[PDB]
Design a protein around this ligand. Structure first.
Ligand SMILES: O=c1cc(N2CCOCC2)nc2n1CC[C@@H](C(F)(F)F)N2C[C@H](O)c1ccccc1
Ligand code: NA
Ligand code: NA
Length: 554
């Protein structure tokens, strides 16, 4: 093989270190191609090499595939890039699936939402041909599972179904994520072949479950029971939303219908996995504690009876698209897991969000109080903390543990909302727990979007700073430390985070759909990959200093 000199090797290392959005010039491509055999020893060089290939040229594609098979095994992040819209070559996509096969189900679950999006770039004929022995509108996606009839060998569809058949948690999310994709009216009208593909994925999944062993066949019946339960809940929600009168009158209708099990079948059901969190098995909804929230959207707070005698409160929305919130909460869940991997638990609240359609879905209810209500009832965050968690020896008369949780969650969310460009940040969408956990909700505005003009990049307020004990407190120093530490940890996983956002470009998420080609760059810019770790610390410190000076000047 051709060996490049020291100067060329250094030049190739700079190209290999380029950020994800960085496009290689034709001259850089010629250089990478010239030393393709040398670069085979570097797993990070593979994604740069594949950017040099014109997939419309059969021999160039063939040359690339031979090197792909000789290359040092790629990482999971790089396999996620090979499943994006950029790579439609079936063999390239098979190699990416071969890498995901080596990953644990725990990691696979973290990327499942994006892997379901990646099906849009798969071979639609291969997915259809996998079906064993009409107009798409005649196939109600919700009726597939409820109507059972009396190393490079696997594509993405075959792989996802195979793993789902062995894991009930994976099967739950695969079922619901595919149902939402089938229910996408924008996909149904603009790309009927994609809508047909998603129906075929569901039909393939139902077929594989029915061919499985005793536990696998039971999984199909449990998915059918969940679909039927959700269908019944949607019918109930429609009746409550149509009920003439005030919220009290709607609550009476809500409780009466939930209480009528012979008609609705919602309060007394056989043990079924909760769609929102399938590890939690439910007995039904408690009729007498179900109420609507004060909102024109009419969302309901529902308490589920768990198998172990517990109560699982949820928010169920009908007539709203939960997909943007679903993506943000799954990214927050991933960010929390990555921070925990680096041994940093910032006491975040990645509450569960699951769309059951593009029109309805669940949200895990965390017992908490919005900051606006905290000020109206107690006056301040510190007063709320002194009332529910007092300590004579603790900082400002508050439990040390509660204060530590507050500082950590403030810092965690400060860094996360900045990276995700979360807008519309007011005191009603900032929530607080009696354990000290501060968290964000309602992700209607992301990636720099805001209802007000000129939004600040850092989402800090006077109430947050006062809750810590001011700018001169030991808590404020801890907050700054946790901010730059969380920032450095997340920057290390920028390749992963960006590759997952790249898989969401065609997902019909409002704030992504607005500018799909600029989405990845918006997130990439927040990581400041142009700066070294030391420079990133000072940049994060500058963001905090500016935000604090600006908020106090009010
Ligand atoms: O997106 C979300 C997420 C969410 N979480 C609740 C805490 O656990 C995590 C999820 N709550 C809401 N929203 C949309 C706006 C309203 C809704 F849905 F009622 F309209 N609320 C309820 C309101 O904030 C509320 C009311 C009373 C107490 C606490 C909270
Ligand atoms: Na039908
Ligand atoms: Na947490």
């Amino acid at each position: 093989d051709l060996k490049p000199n020291a100067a060329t090797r250094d030049q190739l290392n700079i190209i290999v270190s380029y950020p994800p959005t960085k496009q290689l010039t034709y001259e850089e491509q010629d250089l990478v191609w010239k030393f393709r055999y040398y670069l085979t020893n570097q797993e990070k060089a593979l994604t740069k090499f594949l950017k040099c290939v014109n997939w419309d040229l059969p021999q160039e594609a063939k040359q690339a595939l031979e090197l792909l098979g000789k290359w040092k095994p790629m990482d999971v992040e790089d396999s996620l890039e090979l499943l994006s819209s950029h790579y439609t070559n079936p063999t390239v996509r098979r190699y990416a699936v071969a890498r995901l096969r080596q990953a644990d189900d725990e990691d696979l679950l973290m990327y499942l939402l994006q892997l379901v999006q990646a099906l849009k770039y798969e071979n639609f004929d291969d997915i259809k041909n996998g079906l064993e022995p009409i107009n798409s509108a005649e196939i109600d996606s919700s009726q597939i599972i409820t109507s059972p009839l009396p190393n490079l060998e696997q594509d993405l569809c075959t792989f996802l179904i195979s793993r789902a058949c062995k894991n009930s948690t994976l099967a739950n999310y695969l079922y619901w994520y595919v149902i939402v994709e089938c229910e996408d009216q924008d996909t149904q009208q603009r790309d009927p072949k994609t809508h047909e593909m998603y129906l075929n994925v569901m039909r393939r999944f139902s077929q594989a479950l029915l061919k499985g062993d005793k536990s696998v066949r039971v999984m199909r019946s449990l998915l059918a029971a969940q679909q039927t339960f959700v269908d019944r809940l949607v019918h109930l929600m429609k009746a409550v939303q149509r009920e003439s009168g005030n919220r009290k009158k709607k609550n009476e209708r809500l409780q009466a219908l939930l209480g009528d099990n012979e008609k609705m079948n919602l309060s007394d059901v056989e043990l079924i996995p909760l769609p929102l969190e399938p590890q939690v098995k439910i007995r039904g909804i408690i009729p007498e504690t179900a109420t609507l929230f004060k909102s024109a959207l009419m969302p309901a707070q529902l308490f589920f009876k768990t198998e172990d005698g517990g109560k699982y409160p949820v928010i169920f929305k009908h007539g709203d698209d939960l997909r943007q919130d679903q993506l943000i909460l799954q990214i927050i869940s991933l960010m929390d897991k990555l921070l925990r991997k680096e041994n940093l638990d910032l006491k975040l609240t990645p509450y569960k969000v699951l769309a059951t359609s593009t029109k309805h879905g669940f949200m895990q209810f965390i017992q908490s109080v919005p900051v606006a209500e905290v000020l109206d009832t107690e006056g301040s965050i510190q007063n709320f903390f002194r009332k529910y968690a007092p300590s004579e020896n603790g900082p400002n008369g508050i439990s040390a543990e509660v204060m530590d949780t507050y500082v950590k969650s403030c810092a965690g969310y400060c860094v996360i909302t900045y990276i995700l460009g979360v807008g519309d940040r007011h005191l009603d969408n900032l929530l607080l727990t009696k354990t000290g956990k501060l968290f964000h909700i309602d992700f209607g505005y992301i990636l720099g979007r805001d209802p007000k003009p000129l939004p600040p990049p850092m989402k800090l307020n006077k109430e947050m700073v006062e809750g810590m004990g001011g700018t001169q407190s030991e808590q404020y120093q801890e907050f700054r430390k946790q901010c730059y530490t969380a920032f450095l940890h997340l920057r290390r996983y920028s390749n992963l985070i960006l590759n997952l956002f790249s898989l969401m470009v065609d997902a019909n998420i409002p704030d992504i759909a607005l500018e799909p080609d600029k989405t990845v760059k918006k997130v990439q810019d927040k990581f400041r990959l142009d700066l070294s770790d030391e420079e990133a610390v000072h940049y994060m410190q500058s963001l905090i200093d500016e935000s604090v000076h600006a908020l106090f000047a009010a």
